[PDB]
Coordinates of C-alpha atoms in Angstrom, one line a residue:
Chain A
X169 CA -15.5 28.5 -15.4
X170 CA -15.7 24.9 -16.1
X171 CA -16.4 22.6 -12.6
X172 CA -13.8 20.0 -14.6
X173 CA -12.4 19.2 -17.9
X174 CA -15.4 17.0 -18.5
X175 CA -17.9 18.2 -16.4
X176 CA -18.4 21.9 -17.8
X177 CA -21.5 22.7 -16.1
X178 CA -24.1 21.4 -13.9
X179 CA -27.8 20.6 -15.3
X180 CA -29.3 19.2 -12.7
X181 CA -33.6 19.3 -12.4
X182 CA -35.9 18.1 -10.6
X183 CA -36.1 14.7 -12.8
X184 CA -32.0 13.6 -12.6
X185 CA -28.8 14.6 -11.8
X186 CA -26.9 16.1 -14.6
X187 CA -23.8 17.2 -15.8
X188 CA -23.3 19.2 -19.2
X189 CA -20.0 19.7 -21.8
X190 CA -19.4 21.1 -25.2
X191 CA -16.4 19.6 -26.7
X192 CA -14.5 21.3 -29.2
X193 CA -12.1 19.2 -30.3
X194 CA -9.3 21.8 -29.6
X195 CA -8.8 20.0 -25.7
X196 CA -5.8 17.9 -25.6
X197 CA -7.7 14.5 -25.2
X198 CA -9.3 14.9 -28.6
X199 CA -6.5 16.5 -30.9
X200 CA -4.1 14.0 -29.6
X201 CA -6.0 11.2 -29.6
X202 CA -7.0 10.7 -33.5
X203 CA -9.0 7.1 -34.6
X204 CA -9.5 6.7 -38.0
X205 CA -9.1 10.3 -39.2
X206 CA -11.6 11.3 -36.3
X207 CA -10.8 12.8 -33.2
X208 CA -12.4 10.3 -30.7
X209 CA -13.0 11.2 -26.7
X210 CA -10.6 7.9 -25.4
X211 CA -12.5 5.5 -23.4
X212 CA -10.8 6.0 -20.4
X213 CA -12.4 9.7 -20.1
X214 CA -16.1 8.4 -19.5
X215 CA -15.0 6.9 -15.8
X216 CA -13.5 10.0 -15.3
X217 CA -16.5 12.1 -16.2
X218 CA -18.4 9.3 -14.3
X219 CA -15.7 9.9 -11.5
X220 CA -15.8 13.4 -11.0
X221 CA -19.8 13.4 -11.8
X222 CA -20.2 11.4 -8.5
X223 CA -17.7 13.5 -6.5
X224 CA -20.0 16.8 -7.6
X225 CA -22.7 15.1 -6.8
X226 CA -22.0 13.4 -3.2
X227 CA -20.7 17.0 -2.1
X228 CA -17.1 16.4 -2.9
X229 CA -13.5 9.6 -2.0
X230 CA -11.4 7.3 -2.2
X231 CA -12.7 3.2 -2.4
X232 CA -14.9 4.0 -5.5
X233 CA -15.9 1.3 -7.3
X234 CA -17.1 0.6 -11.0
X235 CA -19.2 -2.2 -12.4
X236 CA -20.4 -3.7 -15.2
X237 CA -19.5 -0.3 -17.7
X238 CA -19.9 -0.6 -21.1
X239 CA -18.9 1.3 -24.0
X240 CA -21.3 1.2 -26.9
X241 CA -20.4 4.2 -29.5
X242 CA -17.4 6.7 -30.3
X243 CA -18.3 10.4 -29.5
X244 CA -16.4 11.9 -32.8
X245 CA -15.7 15.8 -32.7
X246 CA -15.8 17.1 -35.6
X247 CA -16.0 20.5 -37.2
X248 CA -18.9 21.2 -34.5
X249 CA -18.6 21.2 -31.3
X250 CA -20.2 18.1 -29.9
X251 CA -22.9 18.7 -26.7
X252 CA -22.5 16.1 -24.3
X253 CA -24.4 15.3 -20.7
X254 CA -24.2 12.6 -17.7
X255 CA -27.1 11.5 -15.9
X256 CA -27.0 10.3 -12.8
X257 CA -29.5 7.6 -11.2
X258 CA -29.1 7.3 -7.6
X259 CA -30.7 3.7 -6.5
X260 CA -31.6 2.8 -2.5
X261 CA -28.8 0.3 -2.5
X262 CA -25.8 2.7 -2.3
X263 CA -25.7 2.3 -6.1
X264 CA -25.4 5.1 -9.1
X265 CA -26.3 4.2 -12.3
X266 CA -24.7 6.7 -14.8
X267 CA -25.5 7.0 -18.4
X268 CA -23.2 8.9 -20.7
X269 CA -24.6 10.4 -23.7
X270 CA -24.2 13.2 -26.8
X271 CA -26.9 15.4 -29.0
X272 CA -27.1 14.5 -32.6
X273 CA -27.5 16.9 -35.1
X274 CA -29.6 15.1 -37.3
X275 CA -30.2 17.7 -40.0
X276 CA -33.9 17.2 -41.4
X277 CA -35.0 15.1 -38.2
X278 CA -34.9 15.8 -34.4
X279 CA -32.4 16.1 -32.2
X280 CA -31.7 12.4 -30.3
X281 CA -29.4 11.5 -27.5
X282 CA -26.7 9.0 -29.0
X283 CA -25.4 6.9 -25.9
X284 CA -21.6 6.2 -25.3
X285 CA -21.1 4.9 -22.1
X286 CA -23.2 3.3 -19.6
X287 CA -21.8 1.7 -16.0
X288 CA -22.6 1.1 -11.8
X289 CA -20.4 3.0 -9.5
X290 CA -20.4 2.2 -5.3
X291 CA -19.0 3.9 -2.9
X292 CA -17.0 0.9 -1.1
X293 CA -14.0 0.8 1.3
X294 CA -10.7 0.4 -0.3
X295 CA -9.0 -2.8 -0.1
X296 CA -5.6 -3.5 1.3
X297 CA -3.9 -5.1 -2.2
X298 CA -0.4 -6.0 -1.9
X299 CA 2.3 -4.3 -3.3
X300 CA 4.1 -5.7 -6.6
X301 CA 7.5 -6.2 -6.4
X302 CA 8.1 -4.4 -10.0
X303 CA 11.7 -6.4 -9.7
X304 CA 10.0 -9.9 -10.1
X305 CA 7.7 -8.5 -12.5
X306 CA 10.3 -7.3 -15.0
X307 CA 12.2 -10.7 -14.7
X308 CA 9.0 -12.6 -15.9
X309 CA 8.5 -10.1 -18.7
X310 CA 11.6 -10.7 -20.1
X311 CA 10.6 -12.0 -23.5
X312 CA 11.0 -8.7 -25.5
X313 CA 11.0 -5.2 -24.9
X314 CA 8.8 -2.6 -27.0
X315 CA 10.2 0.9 -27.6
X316 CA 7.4 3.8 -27.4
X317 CA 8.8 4.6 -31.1
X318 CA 7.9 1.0 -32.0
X319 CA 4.2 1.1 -29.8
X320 CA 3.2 4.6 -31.5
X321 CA 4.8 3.7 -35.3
X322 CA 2.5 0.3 -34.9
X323 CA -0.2 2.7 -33.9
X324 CA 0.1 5.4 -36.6
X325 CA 0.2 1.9 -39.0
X326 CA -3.2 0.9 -37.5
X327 CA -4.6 4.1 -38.0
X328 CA -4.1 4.7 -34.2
X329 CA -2.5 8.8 -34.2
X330 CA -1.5 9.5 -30.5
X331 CA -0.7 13.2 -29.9
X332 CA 2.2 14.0 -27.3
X333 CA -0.9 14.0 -24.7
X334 CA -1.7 10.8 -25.6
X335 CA 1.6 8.9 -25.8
X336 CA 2.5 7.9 -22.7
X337 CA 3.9 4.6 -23.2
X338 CA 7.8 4.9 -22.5
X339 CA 8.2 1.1 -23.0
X340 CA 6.5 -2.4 -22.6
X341 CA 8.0 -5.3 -21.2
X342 CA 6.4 -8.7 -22.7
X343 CA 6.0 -11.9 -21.0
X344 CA 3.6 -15.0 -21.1
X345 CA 0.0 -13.8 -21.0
X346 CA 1.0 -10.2 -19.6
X347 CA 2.7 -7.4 -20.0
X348 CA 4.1 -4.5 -17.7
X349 CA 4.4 -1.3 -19.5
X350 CA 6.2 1.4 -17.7
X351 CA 3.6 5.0 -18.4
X352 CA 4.8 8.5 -17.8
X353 CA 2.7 11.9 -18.0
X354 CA 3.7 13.3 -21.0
X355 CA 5.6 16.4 -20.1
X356 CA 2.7 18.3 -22.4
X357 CA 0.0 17.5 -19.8
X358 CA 1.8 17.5 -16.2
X359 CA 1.0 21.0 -15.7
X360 CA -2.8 19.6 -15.3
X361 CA -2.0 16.6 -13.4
X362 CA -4.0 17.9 -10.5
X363 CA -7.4 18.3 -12.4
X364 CA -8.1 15.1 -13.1
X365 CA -8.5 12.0 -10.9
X366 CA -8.0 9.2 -13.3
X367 CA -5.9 11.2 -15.8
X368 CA -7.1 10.1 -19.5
X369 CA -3.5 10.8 -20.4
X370 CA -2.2 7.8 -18.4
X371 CA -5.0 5.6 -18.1
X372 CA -5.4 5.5 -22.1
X373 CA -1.6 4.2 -22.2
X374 CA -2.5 1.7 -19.7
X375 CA -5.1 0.4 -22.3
X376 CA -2.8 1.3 -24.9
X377 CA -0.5 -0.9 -23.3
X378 CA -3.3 -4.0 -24.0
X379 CA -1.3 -4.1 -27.7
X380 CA 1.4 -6.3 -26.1
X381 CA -0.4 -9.0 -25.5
X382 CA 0.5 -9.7 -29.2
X383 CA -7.9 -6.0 -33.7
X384 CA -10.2 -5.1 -30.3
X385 CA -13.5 -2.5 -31.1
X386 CA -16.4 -1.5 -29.5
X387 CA -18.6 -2.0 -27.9
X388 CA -16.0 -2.2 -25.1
X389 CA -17.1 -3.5 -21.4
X390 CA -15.5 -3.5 -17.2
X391 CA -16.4 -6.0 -15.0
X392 CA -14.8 -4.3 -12.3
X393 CA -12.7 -0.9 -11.4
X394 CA -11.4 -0.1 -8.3
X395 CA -9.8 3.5 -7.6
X396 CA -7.1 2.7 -4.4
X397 CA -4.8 5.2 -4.6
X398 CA -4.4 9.0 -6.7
X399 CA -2.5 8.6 -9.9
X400 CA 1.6 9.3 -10.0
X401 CA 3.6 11.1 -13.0
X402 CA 5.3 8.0 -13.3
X403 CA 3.6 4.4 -13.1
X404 CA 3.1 1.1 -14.0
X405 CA 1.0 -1.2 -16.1
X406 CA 0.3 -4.8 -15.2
X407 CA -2.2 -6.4 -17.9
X408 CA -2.4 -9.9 -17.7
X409 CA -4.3 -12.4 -20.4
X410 CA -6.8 -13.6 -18.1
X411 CA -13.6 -15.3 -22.5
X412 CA -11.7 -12.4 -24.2
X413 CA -10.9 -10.9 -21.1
X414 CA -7.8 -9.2 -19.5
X415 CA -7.3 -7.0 -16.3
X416 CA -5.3 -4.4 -15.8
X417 CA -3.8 -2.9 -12.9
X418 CA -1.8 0.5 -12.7
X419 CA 0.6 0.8 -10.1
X420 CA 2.8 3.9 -9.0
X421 CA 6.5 3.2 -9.0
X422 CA 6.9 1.6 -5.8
X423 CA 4.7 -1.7 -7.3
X424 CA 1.7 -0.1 -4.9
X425 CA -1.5 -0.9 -7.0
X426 CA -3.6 2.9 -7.3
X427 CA -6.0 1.2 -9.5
X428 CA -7.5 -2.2 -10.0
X429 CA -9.4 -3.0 -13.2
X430 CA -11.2 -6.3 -13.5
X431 CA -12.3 -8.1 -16.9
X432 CA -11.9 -5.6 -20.3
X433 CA -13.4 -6.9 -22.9
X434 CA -13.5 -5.7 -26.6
X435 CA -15.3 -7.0 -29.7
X436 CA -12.8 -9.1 -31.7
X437 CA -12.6 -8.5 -35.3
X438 CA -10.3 -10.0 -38.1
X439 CA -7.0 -8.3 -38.9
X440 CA -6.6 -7.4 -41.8
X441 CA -3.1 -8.7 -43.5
Chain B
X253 CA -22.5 32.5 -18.5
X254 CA -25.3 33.1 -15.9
X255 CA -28.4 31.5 -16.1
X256 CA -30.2 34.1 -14.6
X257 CA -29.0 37.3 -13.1
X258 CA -30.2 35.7 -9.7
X259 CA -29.1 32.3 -10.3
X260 CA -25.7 32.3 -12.0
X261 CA -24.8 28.2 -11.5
X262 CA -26.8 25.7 -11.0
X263 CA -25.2 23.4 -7.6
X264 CA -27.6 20.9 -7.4
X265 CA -26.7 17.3 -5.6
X266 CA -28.0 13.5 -4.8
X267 CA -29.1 15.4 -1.3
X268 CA -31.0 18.9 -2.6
X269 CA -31.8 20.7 -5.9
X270 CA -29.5 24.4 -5.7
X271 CA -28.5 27.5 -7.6
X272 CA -26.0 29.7 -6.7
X273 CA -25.2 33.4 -6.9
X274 CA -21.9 35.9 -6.1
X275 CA -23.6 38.8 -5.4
X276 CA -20.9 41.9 -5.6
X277 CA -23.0 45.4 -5.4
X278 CA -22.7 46.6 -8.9
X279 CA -25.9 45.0 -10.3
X280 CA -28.9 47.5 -10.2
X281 CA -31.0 45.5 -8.1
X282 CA -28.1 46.3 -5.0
X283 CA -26.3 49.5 -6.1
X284 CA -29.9 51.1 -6.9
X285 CA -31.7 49.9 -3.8
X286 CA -29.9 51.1 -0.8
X287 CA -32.0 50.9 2.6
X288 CA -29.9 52.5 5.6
X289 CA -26.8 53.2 4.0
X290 CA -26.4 49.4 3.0
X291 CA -27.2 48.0 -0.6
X292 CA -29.7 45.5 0.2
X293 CA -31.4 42.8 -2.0
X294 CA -35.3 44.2 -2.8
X295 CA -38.2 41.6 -1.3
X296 CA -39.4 41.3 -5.1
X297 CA -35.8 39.6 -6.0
X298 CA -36.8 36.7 -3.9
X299 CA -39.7 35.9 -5.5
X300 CA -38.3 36.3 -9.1
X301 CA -34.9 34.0 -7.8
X302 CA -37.9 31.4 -6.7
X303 CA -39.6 31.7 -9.4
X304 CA -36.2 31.3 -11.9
X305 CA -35.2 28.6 -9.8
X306 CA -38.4 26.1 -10.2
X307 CA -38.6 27.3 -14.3

């Protein structure tokens, strides 16, 4: 069988660490999650291939760290499967470099490795963040209050289609240069909470979520992520409006933060009307 | 699927490079080499496994 969802087989040689999956485009975090007429792997997928990739490959926890990840192209699965790898570059610092990439199937030319995500990863100690009082937090984002009907019809408008796997928004709750959106595992998906660290199905809402702060493409970055805590069925999404950049943290429903990320930034592009 | 019928996953880490095997008795190579009552892996195997392994 399949080591993990995104990590379907291990590649390893001599040369690199590796980590090898076909996609389909059947799995629910591609027919759910539709960009543009395309079924698109959602960002938040590559730190958990990254994620598990390390765990694999250190003999597997928590206090992991992410720096400095980018994401440079959409890895589209179309009518053929798609063959995609992870490399691995340990470095004498305590550091792994990790490289995300897919085959092309260049008819007419040679086969070339297209890259879609790049980042650092440390293993560091977790640190002790204070709780959020979700109370205080809902008073200050009191401005207006977004229905997941209204989030996933201004979606679908955008050319945005969430599947049920993919809509885990239940509301947002806007303030002044943040927003707390309240995220639930779809009831679709919940069966497979336990196979995925950073579950793309709730971490994609969490950037979903990054629509209430009132068009963002790739290539996307992270300064900074930091995995606390295991994700909950039911959580919370703190973005706050910090260049173009905005952090994020997702909390379970207590207010405990169970994952800290530091500095998104998207390209910005013109709306159109 | 197996890579090899003596190295049916690759388990490599950071620390060592690694295959791995489940061997059960029904492959020829056990059922048809029994030494003492006991299916027992042939010397030859080990060299072919090597052999797999660093291809």
């Amino acid at each position: 069988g399949v080591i993990h969802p995104f990590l379907h087989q291990n590649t390893s040689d001599f040369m690199e660490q590796r980590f090898s999956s076909m996609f389909t485009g059947q799995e629910f975090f591609l027919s759910d999650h539709v960009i543009k007429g395309q079924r698109v792997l959602p960002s938040a997928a590559y730190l958990e291939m990254a994620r598990a990739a390390i765990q694999q490959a250190t003999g597997g926890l928590e206090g992991l760290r992410f720096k400095n990840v980018v994401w440079t192209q959409p890895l589209a699965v179309g009518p053929e499967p798609v063959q995609a790898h992870i490399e691995l570059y340990p470095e004498a610092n305590g550091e792994i470099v990790f490289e995300i990439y897919s085959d092309s199937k260049q008819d007419r030319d040679q086969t070339t490795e297209i890259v879609h995500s790049q980042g650092s990863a440390v293993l560091c100690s977790i640190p002790d963040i204070p709780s959020f009082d979700l109370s205080v937090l809902q008073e200050q984002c009191s401005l207006r209050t977004l229905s997941a009907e209204q989030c996933y019809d201004a979606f679908k408008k955008m050319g945005v289609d969430y599947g049920p796997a993919h809509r885990g928004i239940e509301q947002i709750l806007i303030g002044q240069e943040q927003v707390l959106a309240k995220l639930s595992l779809p009831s679709s998906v919940v069966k497979t909470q336990g196979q995925f660290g950073l579950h793309p199905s709730l971490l994609d809402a969490a950037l979903q979520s990054s629509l209430g702060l009132m068009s963002l493409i790739l290539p996307f970055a992270l300064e900074e992520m930091v995995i606390v805590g295991d994700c909950s069925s039911s959580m919370w999404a703190l973005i706050r409006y910090r260049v173009e950049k905005f952090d994020i943290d997702l909390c379970d429903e207590n207010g405990n933060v169970q994952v800290r990320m530091k500095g998104f930034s998207t390209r910005k592009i013109a709306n159109v009307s």
